[PDB]
Amino acid sequence: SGGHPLEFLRNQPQFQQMRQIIQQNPSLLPALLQQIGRENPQLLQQISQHQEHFIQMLNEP
Amino acid sequence: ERMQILQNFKHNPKINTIFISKVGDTSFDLPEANVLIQISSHGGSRRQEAQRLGRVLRAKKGMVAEEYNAFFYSLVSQDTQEMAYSTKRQRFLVDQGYSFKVITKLAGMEEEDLAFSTKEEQQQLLQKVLAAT
Amino acid sequence: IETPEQAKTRERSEKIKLEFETYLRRAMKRFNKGVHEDTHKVHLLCLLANGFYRNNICSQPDLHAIGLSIIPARFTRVLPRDVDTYYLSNLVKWFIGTFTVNAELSASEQDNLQTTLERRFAIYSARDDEELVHIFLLILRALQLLTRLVLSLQWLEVFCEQEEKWVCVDCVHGVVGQPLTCYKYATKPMTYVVGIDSDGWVRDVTQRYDPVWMTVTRKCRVDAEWWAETLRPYQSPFMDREKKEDLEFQAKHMDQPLPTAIGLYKNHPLYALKRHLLKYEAIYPETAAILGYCRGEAVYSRDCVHTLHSRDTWLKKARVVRLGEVPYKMVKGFSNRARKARLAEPQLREENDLGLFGYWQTEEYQPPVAVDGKVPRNEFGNVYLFLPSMMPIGCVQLNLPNLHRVARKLDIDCVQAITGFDFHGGYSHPVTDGYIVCEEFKDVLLTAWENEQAVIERKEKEKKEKRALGNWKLLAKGLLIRERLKRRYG
């Protein structure tokens, strides 16, 4: 059990949709880019570390 | 802040009344003045307050011809021991020929309104003083 | 002309407000630019995850079996060790003649990539050029060829053991061993080029295919540290392969473009122009006479360019200049007193020329050893303690507040522990962290500090109790006097 700050983010519903988008179709990339740039200081900070957990989150089927 | 107050006295004409404790003897520099009012003294330091008078009052242009161009007042409470101090002290200044004319009453105090006109204020002042033993 | 002091105060208020708002503006610009850069990095991470997903889909065994069945026996019997340029060209030509470009085929987002590729195999058709690249990758993986799918943010890299080289292959355009041609047929904006192995191992191959990597893209790509951290987990276990690829890249890029533009020689260690150095960095003519020229500008090796620091800064770096060392660079000296003096008269601003020294010119600082219970002190009457090694032997640092009061009370030699420098208003005040004392009295000083802490605690207790008692006494005497005077007049 690799307790990471992205554990809430991994199961975060909007972030769940974002990881689903990243997993298969990058077409909706601009929507995620706009969301993160407009308001995601927390995502900006937390995405720096624990990249493997972030990638595995993006790989959730 | 000490030098701030000193410069305010030196430069600001609105404020020309500075109250100084015993530190005015030698602890700092006294700007040249013309009216020196001494209320309380050490209690017989005939040289200390005479030196304070000498340092406070300096040569000023404009009234050099007149024999009275600097004004010094020494407030002494009647029938107190303070009188015994003053005569003890100004003795040194008597050695230099300086004279002190006794002014029992001040002309003009009646018309101008001053503090403690009522004794009821004065008894409150007495309360305050006796509070500090 | 009216109240000049008010005007001066107004000017000072405007100045301070302007400084505040300008530094706030700069901070805000830094914040939003960093947000943009981080969003760009997250977009790059999304692209990397997309490449991972594509490679994982291309790693399916069903696609391998389909490719093996479709591939004729002529291409099947050729092992990866025997694969050469002619075989690659023949296979690419067969692929072109096998699968064509037909975007008219029905496409649905519901259909999976694997299912779509299997259907295209069934009909021997395709939908897009990237689909052709994926189909060629599947065909190569059918023969278990050591191949990596390379994407531009596309082609394949085949690790030929005859040359031990990652040869570039592009099926749609019939490109074999033409990396520069890959620059044309890939994505036009080429800032990142990533090669993912069938197992998911990621390699940077932007340098090979982008001719402008070593000049512009070197200074115009993403941060090296963040990207290195990103690629660290997926570093390929083939360490020997990585070393060989690095050596090949070095051989290819060793002064290959031969630029001769003055701007290019700036901030480029491979060239290290004398005029393109810094105030502290300086060339070494002993090991660098001439290596090239650009518009009358000589070239010297970067290894002959060395950084320098002041003797005080070297001591801060725990380094002591050797006796008789010559100043490697005599440069502008600036310290509080020195800065004010130089502002007083500019003739000595150039004439100061503090003489820095090289690292090779300075030895490691050797802290002394306390003798006879005496703590050594510098000219400033202290010890510089930028690093723990700087402490003299036989000394102990104690970070106990107000401990020196007890030390002098107990007549114990105690000094401050100079840590660094702080400057609130423009002056580098030394910064100390605790007191350096002799090791012999360390625990005695601790005991004294404990005793004095307890004593000051109880002293504060009795002081506040006596304050309350004095307040009681003052109130009682005040009421007594009030009653007495009221009785005197009522």
Swiss-Prot record, chain A:
Coiled coil: none
Record-annotated membrane-spanning stretches: none
Compartments, as annotated in UniProt: Nucleus; Cytoplasm
Domain STI1 intervals: 4-47
Domain of life of the native organism: Eukaryota
Signal peptide span: none
Function summary: Multiubiquitin chain receptor involved in modulation of proteasomal degradation. Binds to polyubiquitin chains. Proposed to be capable to bind simultaneously to the 26S proteasome and to polyubiquitinated substrates and to deliver ubiquitinated proteins to the proteasome. May play a role in endoplasmic reticulum-associated degradation (ERAD) of misfolded glycoproteins by association with PNGase and delivering deglycosylated proteins to the proteasome.
Family, per entry: Belongs to the RAD23 family.
Summary of subunit composition and partner proteins: Component of the XPC complex composed of XPC, RAD23B and CETN2. Interacts with NGLY1 and PSMC1. Interacts with ATXN3. Interacts with PSMD4 and PSMC5. Interacts with AMFR. Interacts with VCP; the interaction is indirect and mediated by NGLY1.
Comment field on protein domains: The ubiquitin-like domain mediates interaction with ATXN3.
Name of this protein: UV excision repair protein RAD23 homolog B
Species this protein is from: Homo sapiens (Human)
Residues of the full protein shown: 271 to 331 of 409
Curated annotation (Swiss-Prot), chain B:
Domain Helicase C-terminal: 1-115
Sequence positions that bind ATP: 55, 58
Intracellular or extracellular location(s): Nucleus
PTM text: Dephosphorylation reactivates the 5'-excision step. Phosphorylation has no effect on transcription or the 3'-5' helicase activity.
Disease: Xeroderma pigmentosum complementation group B: An autosomal recessive pigmentary skin disorder characterized by solar hypersensitivity of the skin, high predisposition for developing cancers on areas exposed to sunlight and, in some cases, neurological abnormalities. The skin develops marked freckling and other pigmentation abnormalities. Some XP-B patients present features of Cockayne syndrome, including cachectic dwarfism, pigmentary retinopathy, ataxia, decreased nerve conduction velocities.
Subunit structure, as described in the record: Component of the 7-subunit TFIIH core complex composed of XPB/ERCC3, XPD/ERCC2, GTF2H1, GTF2H2, GTF2H3, GTF2H4 and GTF2H5, which is active in NER. The core complex associates with the 3-subunit CDK-activating kinase (CAK) module composed of CCNH/cyclin H, CDK7 and MNAT1 to form the 10-subunit holoenzyme (holo-TFIIH) active in transcription. Interacts with PUF60. Interacts with ATF7IP. Interacts with KAT2A; leading to KAT2A recruitment to promoters and acetylation of histones. (Microbial infection) Interacts with Epstein-Barr virus EBNA2.
Protein family membership: Belongs to the helicase family. RAD25/XPB subfamily.
General remark: The TFIIH core complex from patient XP11BE (a patient with XP/CS who has a C-terminal splice-site frameshift from residue 741 in this protein) reconstitutes in vitro transcription about 30% less well than wild-type but does not restore NER in vitro or in vivo. The XP11BE TFIIH complex has all the subunits in the same stoichiometry as wild-type. Purified mutant protein has very weak 3'-5' helicase and ATPase activities. In another paper the mutant protein has wild-type 3'-5' helicase activity. The mutation is recessive to wild-type. Conventional DNA helicases unwind DNA by binding to a ssDNA overhang of dsDNA and then translocating on this strand with cycles of ATP binding and hydrolysis to 'unzip' the dsDNA. XPB/ERCC3 is believed to be an unconventional DNA helicase principally because it translocates in a 3'-5' direction along dsDNA instead of ssDNA, thus it is referred to as a DNA translocase.
Protein name: General transcription and DNA repair factor IIH helicase/translocase subunit XPB
Biological source species: Homo sapiens (Human)
Organism ancestry: Eukaryota, Metazoa, Chordata, Craniata, Vertebrata
Range of the intact protein held here: 588 to 720 of 782
